Design a protein around this ligand. Structure first.
Ligand SMILES: OC[C@H]1O[C@H](O)[C@H](O)[C@@H](O)[C@@H]1O
Ligand SMILES: OC[C@H]1O[C@H](O)[C@H](O)[C@@H](O)[C@@H]1O
Ligand SMILES: OC[C@H]1O[C@H](O)[C@H](O)[C@@H](O)[C@@H]1O
Ligand SMILES: OC[C@H]1O[C@H](O)[C@H](O)[C@@H](O)[C@@H]1O
Ligand SMILES: OC[C@H]1O[C@](O)(CO)[C@@H](O)[C@@H]1O
Ligand SMILES: OC[C@H]1O[C@](O)(CO)[C@@H](O)[C@@H]1O
Ligand SMILES: OC[C@H]1O[C@](O)(CO)[C@@H](O)[C@@H]1O
Ligand SMILES: OC[C@H]1O[C@](O)(CO)[C@@H](O)[C@@H]1O
Ligand SMILES: [Mn+2]
Ligand SMILES: [Mn+2]
Ligand SMILES: [Mn+2]
Ligand SMILES: [Mn+2]
Ligand SMILES: [Mn+2]
Ligand SMILES: [Mn+2]
Ligand SMILES: [Mn+2]
Ligand SMILES: [Mn+2]
Lengths: 387, 387, 387, 387
């Protein structure tokens, strides 16, 4: 059971399985993977596709012809396997020139360079068939309060994304942008640190319809936030364009554990939500096989990502289909939450004495919500302990 | 030095100095304060004004005539002292009926009751001259994932605020709404948990211009977020309608320490920002004198709030006026952050070979940002150690 | 399946199911429970026993004869049901007199009073057959740095516990003490904030053998610590005298969720450890049924505590009995971790050239730990997805 | 003012100022520093000394004669400048062989290698005159629960430290060990994660007198703990052998900011404590100049460490010498905290009716602690705002 196939739409970044294990306190524990080899290994495990930063696919500073050759070999592997490229992104974080940011570097020349590097990869992404272009502003931020005027920085951020929107519109490209929040690391505080901040920012862009969010499980958890709540807000706004799936154990460094590790209950409620809402985008994993692992462990970790999603999907589906759960949901008045509070309108509400003057506050207060019983039914379903 | 006067616009909630010291593990340590007495004591310390929830001023369940009498006595104290009431709010959290929320309770009758309780206090607030009406959804949330469908809850939240907006518009009242985020406590996760989430939500209301945010120092810090960054985003959006000032030591329960306690450097950078941006609203303190304190300690704690703001204001002003700091800010290219990245437009950027083909990436990378020197000048100014 | 019986040794505090739902922002949602009624309800659910603070059983300020009568009625219920009282504790936190602590209050008279209140309840506990007496220093701490000289406070803490040890020794009582850490709440920082700090402190008492720890799942998680690691250290030291079981979602206020809620994987690894190590003490639940719940929800929440332990016990047992897991544990060299590094002694180690001069560092480095495969087998067992 | 001299005993690790700026998301921004150059630059800024890991001074895998030459050149720089080497440590974290630990690696051969690498550097440290040898178990831990049996791991940890203690005793070396805790990073959870856990562990070693702690400001703050409280416990136990000074903004990745940055009030209370208790060891800075900085910024950041200590020292000293503060400390009964609760003994306490039967609980409860006034005097002193 729980065998993935390409129709489950599981995708992986090249940088995930290709992570060599260099951390801030130690050297690489694994050799570099050829992108072609990752493509084939992932196809064999049942993945749908891969994603890339520019610099994962084409070594930084490659000539135009080295570049052609890298793309050609990759494209051949995609053709041989049937793997897709639904998303791409830019590396605006590794090279030293990006030490104070890309789009919001204090140096204007760096900001211009960041835009040009990005635009060149948008052309490549469209050529490979990507529908979503992710921006992760990992260096946009500060360690000290005087270093970054945040209002000016947001003006620069909006300028950058507006220009990118003008570019795609002018070229007639069919690609949308997704902003990936993260609250900190590697900068002390990162700009647009949560899904909320990103959603609010998007509404001030010149063409807000071209921009959504790419939330990551572990990033929101680094701020102690409820990830399924955040995703529900993004879905409610119509802005869940892509998602990064992984695990995280609490408020600490960005662990990027395989999906299902970390906060397992939150993973269950995330799956429940994605599947109930009909999210139809890629189930993308942004994870790092731990540096303890050899190559066999790398592939085992990747497989476990997919396995854990398909297990949780089954459990959530059983939960929602259970008539005893359906009855519980009514006992807890989930049905009533979905009805309008005042479809009769404001004047009717104001004239309704059962809403205030004659509302029996004590009787309403005495009614239990029956949430603990509901939650235990959810636990029993997750654990497969329904007698 | 550092004596406040009413022109500094310092305000306090009645619930702040009036907090009796009941916590989840212990009984009250102080007797209840009469609102009239708080008004006079605060006027003597140099405050500008007070704020209230409905239930702080009028005991829950008062008759129409007890209500009149409470308001009359309060109004007399305001007239005797010259104190203003710039803000008011509703208690939709204390009474048991609000155990699952007000605006987003699963029970529809409770939601209607929450709206009616709110509207009655909006009329009172306008009569007392409040310009801002705060909403803190402290019970809107969940302890378990199945208890609250978050999409439906946001539909209900938007319904409630839309109706309030219709009400104020229809009455011709000159009052705006400010949403006060908090990430958790007393619910396991609270809806709209940060300034970002609140800002994004506001953009989906029918009349977004009537709604802003009332961010609180300690609340954003409960998610480990940078408070001055959050306020800069709110100012950038034009939505900083009011602010709650206090202190918080990290990610834990909501401490509500006096302003300046907690993260002192963040307090300095907040003051710097508010004063540089010309925020002209109330400097409102939402703090709890610790339960260790008697009445003399209560007034000492309140006075310290004001004192610490005026000290930090002086230090920030000295920082920004220091020519050596002005030179540092140029050395760190803050000037350049404020200039447009590409006022020449997209086509010019694309044709500019100095932005990419001929950009010397190594030379740009080698340039230091000089941020540590700048930050030490900021430290020296804060500490009054400029030789 | 998963029906508890008294032989599973599940115990509950009277304050758990008896929590009325008063939180720092709201009033009680449930009426007070008679201790006799809790005893009978818990006996019917299959619990083994109950625990109490002095003030849960005997209202503060009771006369000697009211006291007798309270104890008599409780004792009758214990006799009627077969319920035991394995643990007792003192309330040194609720009454205002304890606002700055009990054992470490700055006022010496309060400290003496705290000792006398404690000793009176130790006599009661011994009469009811308790084997463990818990001390939770919830008020021992500070909100500000100058308020508490911590060295003097630790001298006072050690003085208090030494005196209690002298008391029990002098009376010939067969009772041991267990210190329950918590890092913060209701004080800004609490003394002995983690299991580590408590263990270290115990070693400086005059009779360290009489003192152990009473760690609580949610408390260690409030500091972002791994609870099963902490318990392993306490077991290694021979100091796990009692345990508090509950759930907690990350670094925030003390939630006291039912056991199994919160961090579900950590619950699995805790059960695995307790059962593998042969912990033979009570499985005590210190939880709060959420205030959303009526009485039916209270009992459902309590039942779920027990259910979730018995499910996890079964899953952990299946994990460790699985031959494929046993083989995995060898592949990951858990066997080798259990062997002495240098049973040959220091000189032999120093003369062993295969340990250094001729150690092939590259070959050792290339070996994968196979941890991800092991962890996925653990996941599959937890979820009941072993094909 | 605030010019350091070698008598202030400020020390720096070679790895601090020598950090090249490689982080988990980016390449180095600065070239490698020769240790000789760091020694001379630091001597010019007024430092007392430097500290080293084996691998900072002697490139891993050096021959015996390269090794001699590295040590000779370093020793010459020490002789030229008058700089001391008070502390040394081992790198048991960088090389891939240490991916699962040094002392607690599951592979027994790695554990033996870790011991031999350590012993070789203890000989070097003694030759250079170090009095303290630090052990930071950065790789001792796990990402998953099944990977590390923690009891066995602690047996292995104790074995390793016992053997080191036997080694130094047998050689007659005058050097003590200090364990440096950290709660996580680069492992998901690290063993002995706080000062408490380390202190408790030390008490189970064969010769506990040879072992103390090397607490780091930012590490304890990564668990949300109060650093001055932790240090007070270490001083109370007589185990503060060395300290790492730096700054950290809350619960996140290990920032290693310059001292005084981060939580500035905690820095003030730490300085107050160190100076009041007469700590006479090195004031060692374990900080990372941010990667935004060039070499000029590196030296500015290092200088700021020292400056900020000397400013805080002056402010704390002024605080404690202020007669108005001395009077406040009596008003808050700090004097009484320092007196024994029951120097009269247990029987006298039991017979003292003023301790219980006739204690007026209400009168004691009504007395305010006056802590807020005290804390504001502390604030005013820190800020230099005493009129
Ligand atoms: O944006 C693409 C990716 O870039 C980097 O690898 C980030 O660490 C990751 O979280 C993000 O998803
Ligand atoms: O909204 C008004 C106030 O209501 C409550 O007292 C909250 O605890 C507080 O943070 C908020 O500012
Ligand atoms: O010590 C007994 C109990 O006292 C209080 O109720 C605490 O909140 C709880 O954690 C502790 O277990
Ligand atoms: O133990 C010596 C040092 O080793 C490493 O550099 C650690 O990151 C640091 O915290 C520690 O102080
Ligand atoms: O470019 C205008 C900008 O200039 C600043 O005052 C920089 O000093 C900003 O805070 C504002 O967005
Ligand atoms: O009222 C329509 C709503 O109904 C739900 O499906 C409730 O099941 C929501 O998730 C959506 O906002
Ligand atoms: O009672 C002796 C004690 O006195 C203090 O100096 C109080 O000033 C302590 O820090 C020490 O433990
Ligand atoms: O070496 C004895 C050790 O063996 C284990 O059971 C390993 O299975 C430990 O938990 C204990 O410390
Ligand atoms: Mn991540
Ligand atoms: Mn990601
Ligand atoms: Mn607050
Ligand atoms: Mn507030
Ligand atoms: Mn608890
Ligand atoms: Mn407990
Ligand atoms: Mn560190
Ligand atoms: Mn350190």
């Amino acid at each position: 059971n729980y065998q993935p196939t390409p129709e489950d739409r599981f995708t992986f970044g090249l940088w995930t399985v290709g992570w060599q294990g260099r951390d801030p306190f130690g050297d690489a524990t694994r050799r570099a993977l050829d992108p072609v080899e990752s493509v084939r290994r992932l196809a064999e495990l049942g993945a749908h596709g891969v994603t890339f930063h520019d610099d994962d696919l084409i070594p930084f500073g490659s000539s135009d012809s080295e570049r052609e050759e890298h793309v050609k070999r990759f494209r051949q592997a995609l053709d041989d396997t049937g793997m897709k490229v639904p998303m791409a992104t830019t590396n605006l974080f590794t090279h030293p020139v990006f030490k104070d940011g890309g789009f919001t570097a204090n140096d204007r020349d760096v900001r211009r360079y960041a835009l040009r590097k990005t635009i060149r990869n948008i052309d490549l992404a469209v050529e490979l068939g990507a529908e979503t272009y992710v921006a992760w502003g990992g260096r946009e931020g500060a360690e000290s309060g005087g270093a970054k005027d945040v209002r000016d920085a947001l003006d620069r951020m909006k300028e950058a994304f507006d220009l990118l929107g003008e570019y795609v519109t002018s070229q007639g490209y069919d690609i949308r942008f997704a902003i990936e929040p993260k609250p900190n690391e590697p900068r002390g505080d990162i700009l647009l640190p949560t899904v909320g901040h990103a959603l609010a920012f998007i509404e001030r862009l010149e063409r807000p319809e071209l921009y959504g969010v790419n939330p990551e499980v572990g990033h929101e958890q680094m701020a102690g936030l409820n990830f399924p709540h955040g995703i529900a807000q993004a879905l409610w706004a119509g802005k869940l364009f892509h998602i990064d799936l992984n695990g995280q154990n609490g408020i600490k460094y960005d662990q990027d554990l395989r999906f299902g590790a970390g906060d397992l209950r939150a993973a269950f409620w995330l799956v429940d939500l994605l599947e109930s809402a009909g999210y139809s985008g890629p189930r993308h994993f942004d994870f790092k096989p731990p540096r303890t692992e050899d190559f066999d462990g790398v592939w085992a970790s990747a497989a476990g990502c997919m396995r854990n999603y398909l297990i949780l999907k089954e459990r959530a589906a059983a939960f929602r289909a259970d008539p005893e759960v359906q009855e519980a949901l009514r006992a807890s008045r989930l049905d009533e939450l979905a009805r309008p509070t005042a479809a009769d309108g404001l004047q009717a509400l104001l004239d309704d004495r059962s809403a205030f003057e004659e509302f029996d506050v004590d009787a309403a207060a005495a009614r239990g919500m029956a949430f603990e019983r509901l939650d235990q039914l959810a636990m029993d379903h997750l654990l497969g302990a329904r007698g």
